[PDB]
Amino acid sequence: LIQAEEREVSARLAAAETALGESDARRQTQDAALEDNALEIDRLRNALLQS
Amino acid sequence: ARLADSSAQQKAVERRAGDLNVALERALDRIRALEEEADGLRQRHAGVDTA
């Protein structure tokens, strides 16, 4: 009966480990684009401003 | 001799015109220098706007 309660935990283990990495890694997939566009933005800043 | 004298006042007018002329060129040169100086003012307006 104590064993069964941990059967709930294994999913709580299974989900979180999935819920943890696959988003934090996902965030880096989002993270790079920020500076990617921002650096484009910075030249996009002075472009008119130099023109 | 009368002709000489009237020509003499005309020579005074000539000196006036020559001073007027040299003033004209120097004023024009100052005008140009003003043009580049305002150019510079514009750059030091724009860059700090960017900043």
Angle in degrees, 0-180, between the axes of helices B2-50 and A2-50, rounded to the nearest 10: 170
Which value in Å is the resolution of this experimental model? 5.8
| Portion 2-41 of A in contact with B at CB < 8 A | none
CB contact under 8 Å between B46 and A49, yes or no, is: yes
Reduced to 3 states (helix: H, G, I; strand: E, B; else coil), residue B37 is helix
Give the C-alpha distances (Å, rounded to integers) separating A15 from A5, A27, B49: 16, 18, 51
In chain A, which residue's Cα lies nearest the Cα of B51?
Answer: A46
Give the whole-angstrom CA distance, residue A20 versus residue A27: 11
Cβ atoms A44, B50 nearer than 8 A: no
CB contact under 8 Å between A46 and B46, yes or no, is: no
Reduced to 3 states (helix: H, G, I; strand: E, B; else coil), residue B48 is helix
DSSP state of A25: H
Give the whole-angstrom CA distance, residue A21 versus residue A31: 14
Give the whole-angstrom CA distance, residue A43 versus residue B8: 69
